[PDB]
Design a protein around this ligand. Structure first.
Ligand code: CFH
Ligand code: CFH
Ligand code: CFH
Ligand code: CFH
Lengths: 6, 6, 6, 6
């Protein structure tokens, strides 16, 4: 899986 | 501001 | 600002 | 198998 942000 | 995770 | 995975 | 992003 991959994820992120802000 | 404050944030993060993963 | 964050990101991750694999 | 491949994955990525951000
Ligand atoms: O979630 C992984 C990714 F990101 F697609 F490569 C997996 F390989 F496990 F599918
Ligand atoms: O965003 C800051 C926080 F996180 F609320 F402390 C500020 F105080 F500057 F609003
Ligand atoms: O992305 C960060 C967060 F999470 F919003 F605090 C930044 F401080 F950089 F805005
Ligand atoms: O996921 C691989 C791919 F990319 F299809 F070749 C596997 F060899 F494992 F199928």
């Amino acid at each position: 899986v991959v994820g992120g942000x802000x």
